[PDB]
């Protein structure tokens with residue numbers, strides 16, 4: 001029977017729940033009868049990535065729209081869906097390709113979690129919570145609610161909830177201090193880079209067994225670079241509600257998980273519109289998507305030598321931008337050092 005703190009036990013139970021994995025796939029309208037969770041495979045997901053890349057190439061290189069029709073149907077054969085009586089969305093425009101790329105990103109970490117679960121060694125004299133905790137290769141400690149860490153983090157949550165994201169209120173349930181094995185050594189070449197910032201990264205709960213196991217990762221080479229607004233990198237935000245929207249919580253599942261990561265941004269290539277890149281020009285270390293609203297810079301606080309942009313939202317004065325709020329993208333996984341994991345309750349306004 002596990003000795004782990006009860007909040008950590010609840011976390012392990014949440015991120016390894018198999019039925020949550022199936023619910024996520026059903027939410028995507030994937031046919032569970034034809035393609036069960038156990039038949040989901042990494043090379044199958046990579047093959048689906050390549051079809052999206054084929055669609056990307058066929059659209060831009062001026063091929064037949066007829067081929068694009070066939071590539072779309074091939075995607076729905078490779079990944080069986082079940083839209084009941086409705087017509088499955090056609091894969092012929094960037095809008096549809098980006099939605100399927102997002103779906104494959106989620107399937108990729110679901111496969112990592114399920115394979116983690118069904119692998120390794122097993123011992124019936126051990127609590128499955130203890131076994132699954134050790135499979136994450138991550139030290140997880142509860143942050144004291146009255147500590148100054150929690151104070152700064154709660155202030156960060158309190159001040160950076162955008163007015164536009166008015167559908168819900170956020171309530172911090174647990175603050176976890178996490179150390180992924182090996183990630184600190186991997187981050188060492190970037191530890192002294194300038195412009196280090198503590199930024200948010202939200203994701204579906206079904207992704208976090210893979211995120212704690214493997215870290216935040218760049219989409220595989222088969223993934224289409226045009227499937228993501230700023231290409232294939234790791235995305236962060238400085239508004240907690242922007243990243244909280246990527247938790248994709250609902251009134252049925254109102255508990256979300258959000259990361260605080262130390263990100264070495266260096267020289268930021270500042271952009272106002274989409275730019276589908278996989279690498280940066282020499283002398284640039286990150287992309288900053290310029291939003292119309294930014295945390296007030298005069299209110300930046302230092303936490304363990306890292307900037308925390310917890311200022312309240314003010315106009316950035318940035319002219320023509322497709323972004324309401326800022327985005328930060330790095331294109332090297334060694335530029336990220338995950339520090340905290342928050343468990344939030346979404347209180348939806350009605």
Ligand SMILES: CCC(CC)N1CCN(C(=O)c2cc(Cn3c(=O)[nH]c(=O)c4ccccc43)ccc2F)CC1=O
Nearest residue numbers: 105109201202207216217219233234235236237243246
């Ligand atoms: C988790 C599965 C794996 C699969 C390899 N994965 C997926 C890709 N990825 C990203 O960071 C990533 C995220 C978004 C969307 N987005 C988000 O989801 N949360 C945020 O807070 C956020 C904040 C600002 C902007 C976008 C955000 C788009 C493109 C990306 F590349 C790293 C990663 O590891």
